[PDB]
Amino acid sequence: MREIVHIQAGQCGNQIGAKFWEVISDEHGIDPTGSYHGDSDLQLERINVYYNEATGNKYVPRAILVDLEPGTMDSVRSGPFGQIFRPDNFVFGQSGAGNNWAKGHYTEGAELVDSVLDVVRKESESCDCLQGFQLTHSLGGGTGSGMGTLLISKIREEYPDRIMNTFSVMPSPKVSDTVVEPYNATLSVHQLVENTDETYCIDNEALYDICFRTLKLTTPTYGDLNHLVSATMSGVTTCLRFPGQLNADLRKLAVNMVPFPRLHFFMPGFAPLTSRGSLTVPELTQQMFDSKNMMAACDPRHGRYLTVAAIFRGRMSMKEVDEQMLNVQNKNSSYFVEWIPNNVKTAVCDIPPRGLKMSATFIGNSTAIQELFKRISEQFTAMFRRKAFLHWYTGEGMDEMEFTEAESNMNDLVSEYQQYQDATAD
Amino acid sequence: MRECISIHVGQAGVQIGNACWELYCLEHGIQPDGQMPSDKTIGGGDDSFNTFFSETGAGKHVPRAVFVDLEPTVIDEVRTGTYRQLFHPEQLITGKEDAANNYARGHYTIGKEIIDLVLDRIRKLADQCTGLQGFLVFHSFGGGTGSGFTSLLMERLSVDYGKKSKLEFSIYPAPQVSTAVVEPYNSILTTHTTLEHSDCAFMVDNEAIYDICRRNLDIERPTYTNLNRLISQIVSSITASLRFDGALNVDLTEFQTNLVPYPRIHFPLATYAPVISAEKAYHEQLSVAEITNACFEPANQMVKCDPRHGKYMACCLLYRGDVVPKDVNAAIATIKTKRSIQFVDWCPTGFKVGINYQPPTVVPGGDLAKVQRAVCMLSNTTAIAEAWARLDHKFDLMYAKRAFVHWYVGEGMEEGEFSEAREDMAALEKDYEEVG
Amino acid sequence: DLGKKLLEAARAGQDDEVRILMANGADVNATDASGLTPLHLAATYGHLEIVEVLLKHGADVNAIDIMGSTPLHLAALIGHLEIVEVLLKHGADVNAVDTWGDTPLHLAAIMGHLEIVEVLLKHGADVNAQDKFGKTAFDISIDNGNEDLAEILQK
Numbered sequence A: 001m002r003e004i005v006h007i008q009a010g011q012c013g014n015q016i017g018a019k020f021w022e023v024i025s026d027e028h029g030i031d032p033t034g035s036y037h038g039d040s041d042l043q044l045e046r047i048n049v050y051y052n053e054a055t056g057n058k059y060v061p062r063a064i065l066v067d068l069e070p071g072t073m074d075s076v077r078s079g080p081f082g083q084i085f086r087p088d089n090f091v092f093g094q095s096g097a098g099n100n101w102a103k104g105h106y107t108e109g110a111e112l113v114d115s116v117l118d119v120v121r122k123e124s125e126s127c128d129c130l131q132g133f134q135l136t137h138s139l140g141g142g143t144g145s146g147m148g149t150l151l152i153s154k155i156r157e158e159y160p161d162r163i164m165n166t167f168s169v170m171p172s173p174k175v176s177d178t179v180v181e182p183y184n185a186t187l188s189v190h191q192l193v194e195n196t197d198e199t200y201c202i203d204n205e206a207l208y209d210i211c212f213r214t215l216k217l218t219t220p221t222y223g224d225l226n227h228l229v230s231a232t233m234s235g236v237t238t239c240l241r242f243p244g245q246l247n248a249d250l251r252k253l254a255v256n257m258v259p260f261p262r263l264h265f266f267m268p269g270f271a272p273l274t275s276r277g278s279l280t281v282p283e284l285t286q287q288m289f290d291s292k293n294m295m296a297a298c299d300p301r302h303g304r305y306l307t308v309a310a311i312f313r314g315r316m317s318m319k320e321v322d323e324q325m326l327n328v329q330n331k332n333s334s335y336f337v338e339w340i341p342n343n344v345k346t347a348v349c350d351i352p353p354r355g356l357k358m359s360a361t362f363i364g365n366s367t368a369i370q371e372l373f374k375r376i377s378e379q380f381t382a383m384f385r386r387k388a389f390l391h392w393y394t395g396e397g398m399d400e401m402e403f404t405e406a407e408s409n410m411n412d413l414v415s416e417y418q419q420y421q422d423a424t425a426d
Numbered sequence B: 001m002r003e004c005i006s007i008h009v010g011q012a013g014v015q016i017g018n019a020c021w022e023l024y025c026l027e028h029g030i031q032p033d034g035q036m037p038s039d040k041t042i043g044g045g046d047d048s049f050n051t052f053f054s055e056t057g058a059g060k061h062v063p064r065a066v067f068v069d070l071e072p073t074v075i076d077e078v079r080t081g082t083y084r085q086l087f088h089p090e091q092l093i094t095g096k097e098d099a100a101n102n103y104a105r106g107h108y109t110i111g112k113e114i115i116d117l118v119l120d121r122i123r124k125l126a127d128q129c130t131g132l133q134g135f136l137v138f139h140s141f142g143g144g145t146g147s148g149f150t151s152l153l154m155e156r157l158s159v160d161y162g163k164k165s166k167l168e169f170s171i172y173p174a175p176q177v178s179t180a181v182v183e184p185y186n187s188i189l190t191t192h193t194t195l196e197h198s199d200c201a202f203m204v205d206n207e208a209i210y211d212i213c214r215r216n217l218d219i220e221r222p223t224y225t226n227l228n229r230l231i232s233q234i235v236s237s238i239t240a241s242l243r244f245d246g247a248l249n250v251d252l253t254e255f256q257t258n259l260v261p262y263p264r265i266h267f268p269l270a271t272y273a274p275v276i277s278a279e280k281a282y283h284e285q286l287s288v289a290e291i292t293n294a295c296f297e298p299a300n301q302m303v304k305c306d307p308r309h310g311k312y313m314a315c316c317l318l319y320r321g322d323v324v325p326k327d328v329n330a331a332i333a334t335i336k337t338k339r340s341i342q343f344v345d346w347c348p349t350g351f352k353v354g355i356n357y358q359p360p361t362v363v364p365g366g367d368l369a370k371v372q373r374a375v376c377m378l379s380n381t382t383a384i385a386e387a388w389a390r391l392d393h394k395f396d397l398m399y400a401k402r403a404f405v406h407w408y409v410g411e412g413m414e415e416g417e418f419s420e421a422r423e424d425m426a427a428l429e430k431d432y433e434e435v436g
Numbered sequence C: 001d002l003g004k005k006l007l008e009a010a011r012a013g014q015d016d017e018v019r020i021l022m023a024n025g026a027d028v029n030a031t032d033a034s035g036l037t038p039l040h041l042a043a044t045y046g047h048l049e050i051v052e053v054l055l056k057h058g059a060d061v062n063a064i065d066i067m068g069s070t071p072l073h074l075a076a077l078i079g080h081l082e083i084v085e086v087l088l089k090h091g092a093d094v095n096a097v098d099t100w101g102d103t104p105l106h107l108a109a110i111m112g113h114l115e116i117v118e119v120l121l122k123h124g125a126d127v128n129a130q131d132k133f134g135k136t137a138f139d140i141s142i143d144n145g146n147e148d149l150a151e152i153l154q155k
């Protein structure tokens, strides 16, 4: 339980995946060339989780970069850390997928999937004890959604005993008003329920509303949204990259966060919410469970928490954190299921993120996430009832029954969240 | 002299094992390199401390202990700690991947890949014994390795060592310093599977040790180091009769004779007094009567329960230090005039007394002050059924919804084993109710 | 049969092919198997010019398919603001109802086409119109937590 193989697919997957490496390298003391410039030994103690150590004390991210669009590869290399990636790990096709889930999953991306699996095996066999795989992608496109889910299925076949973790970006008309995105998202959710052990739901609807209404950014860009993503991806992986009082790994997270196999979609939250350019412990605990701080556009007070994991970063009293966390569970006791005792776990890490002194990252398995899937299901149904643009998919080998099964499995997932939201202990 | 082998399973068992053996050395005068100057016979012997320590030709005194864990982080700290030269390197066994807080991983999948190596190393220590009497097993309830692997180990030990006794030191889970949500699952699963392979089990309630650290030692937020130093002081008081000359509980058989009237009800309650903070170095010394009265206060017990709600089936008082036997008699005669102490109709309503006239040793760096006299009370009371009731309730809340069960079934375990383990716990509760 | 060719030319966006077929007698109001007309397909695929040329040659702006969808329904669903205004200027029924109870305001609200929502309101969209489940356009905004959409409906 040590090394994680990171994969990123599509424009969104490579864009937010690049920012992820820029953030954690800055926290570990790694420069764009790959040398350790840090001043604390706690930065290299678990550095092997995400990086491969080469000769000359040179750390290389254990990352695989995939996309059917060749243009995304050039934008990554022109980035600040574009040179730190192993050039053999760039697997880029010739023609894009054109926001078509059927292209990435059945035609175009199916031709390139074997070229990606070869790079996965080479990285996996270079691991002392492979922990699992980490994928970043969007669900609204064609490559990260169609081929991303295809990659998950094949990797799941060859490495069935390893954890599959995704950072999946949910589509929103407020950001990209392309009407086939509800198709691609629903088809991917059908795949994510079966083939992933834990999924972080990052909602562009939530990211936009945070930038527009909270950060007062009049016209948010992808960089404004990705700033919130990288801060969240840094927080959720803190206990994997630093020692701490717990030997946390991807499997211990899944065992203690996922009470039922299908309900493995997490609602992440971050505090404080800052923007590029611009705090007590009771403020962090309060602001963490606030609906405005959730990276998924859902009100947690409309559902119940099945499991909650909270990460605090910075200098603070672990007794005060224990007292404040125990306070929130009493005022909001009705928002926690009572048939899972001690379902809130807290970790404190000394090293805080860049530009911040106090941080609070929230990972919740809440039944309120059904609001996210109800939204996508309604848009999907509005399009699917009129059979709009269905030939874009059926013309690539997709059977029309695959849409009905994705919709059915989508609605079944919502019913299961509602089922445990209403269940009591008696 | 009959040798005893200690087995330390999982993080809790290893770390508690580290603090115990450190204390054992200070009590016996053994240096971190294994040298014991007061040992007149070099290369062997028949003294009482030889039950726990073997001797090499070079005068080195090696613990009869095996450390096992499915991941190496915790055990690696022993390989580089203060007592790294004390243990055989082959006694410290580590895997690569732990049980992920999953009983089934520790018992069925991951545990099977190292079980045979552990037994072969145990057999190596057993062959060096002239009269092996049994094993002491240290492990947690809530850990995947501490529960899943321990159950697997105790099963194989009953086959290879049928007549030998097996004693447990188990760590009862507490919400304050817990690790996993599924710790109630692992606790019930390992209790059901080990119940028939264990002759006597001393439960340590982490919540009880936690509160004693806050209230008696004035430690605001206790850590595993604070709890384990206190726990080792109690474990030392329980095993002192095996390592020193004495008249009470001189071997593992007398533990069951004195504390276990029936096999299934083999969970004695331990009480330790006095627990004084090291900052109060010039504290007044408590009398025999004062520390004896403290053994019947619920605030001094290693498991949270009310002995006034239950009946006693056995009671052993182990004293250490400046203790005149006639003062114990008078102190007991006062306890016999208390309604809070009720014995069952069928047991001889008496207290067994054993006195070691050496005061307790304190570890440098510990939170405990030196005392001239201390007492550990080992008693079998039906009030410890409350601890099983709290654990069964947490199990029932999650299992009624079948929460987290797929993680166990996915590791080669039939779902019916949950109900079979739960029904056995329901039977254990009735065993206490039928007694009292 | 030129009706089938006009249907494909309307979907594909072949402006010149549309003018040639109409000049040779092609049925402007021809329907496919599901009742879609060239105006339906042109409004679905965002061919603004073909929408205009069809309306100048006797295209029924309020034609419905088997599911009761008008061209305004599909234009509001896909999000073609310019086509929506052209249809409204040529007499499209802003409150037309399909077999699911949906008005063009319902579809524009569900898909987040806020600018189209404003245009439909400016032309008399019924905010009190319910679908087959009793949901109005304002109910949809409240249910999915769309504050931006809820403001527009209260103007």
Ligand SMILES: Nc1nc2c(ncn2[C@@H]2O[C@H](COP(=O)(O)OP(=O)(O)OP(=O)(O)O)[C@@H](O)[C@H]2O)c(=O)[nH]1
Pocket: A009, A010, A011, A012, A013, A015, A016, A067, A069, A096, A097, A098, A099, A100, A138, A139, A140, A141, A142, A143, A144, A145, A169, A170, A171, A172, A175, A176, A181, A204, A207, A222, A225, A226, A229
């Ligand atoms: N938050 C965030 N979302 C993004 C970003 N880039 C794209 N998206 C979202 O991703 C969705 C479309 O998926 P893309 O990743 O752009 O497309 P793809 O996965 O490469 O597949 P193709 O469309 O065939 O190229 C849209 O809904 C976008 O809003 C980004 O940098 N940040």
Ligand SMILES: Nc1nc2c(ncn2[C@@H]2O[C@H](COP(=O)(O)OP(=O)(O)OP(=O)(O)O)[C@@H](O)[C@H]2O)c(=O)[nH]1
Pocket: B009, B010, B011, B012, B013, B015, B016, B069, B070, B098, B099, B100, B101, B102, B106, B140, B141, B142, B143, B144, B145, B146, B147, B171, B172, B173, B174, B177, B178, B179, B180, B183, B206, B224, B227, B228, B231
């Ligand atoms: N008293 C005490 N309790 C501990 C210690 N370490 C862990 N625990 C308790 O043990 C339980 C978790 O079991 P562990 O022993 O840590 O897990 P494990 O046996 O290594 O098995 P894995 O799941 O594979 O890690 C929790 O309830 C902890 O409170 C310790 O050093 N002292």
Ligand SMILES: COc1ccc(/N=N/c2cc(OC)c(OC)c(OC)c2)cc1O
Pocket: A236, A237, A239, A240, A246, A248, A249, A250, A252, A253, A256, A257, A307, A308, A309, A310, A311, A342, A343, A344, A345, A346, A347, A363, B179, B180, B181
């Ligand atoms: C709900 O209760 C639990 C959940 C997970 C548990 N341990 N696994 C991890 C713990 C983490 O933070 C506390 C963490 O950081 C978020 C993590 O990142 C991988 C793993 C233990 C629990 O008791």
Ligand SMILES: [Ca+2]
Pocket: B039, B040, B041, B042, B043, B044, B045, B046, B055
């Ligand atoms: Ca000797």
Ligand SMILES: [Mg+2]
Pocket: A010, A011, A069, A096, A141, A143
């Ligand atoms: Mg793209």
Ligand SMILES: [Mg+2]
Pocket: B010, B011, B071, B098, B143, B145
């Ligand atoms: Mg462990």
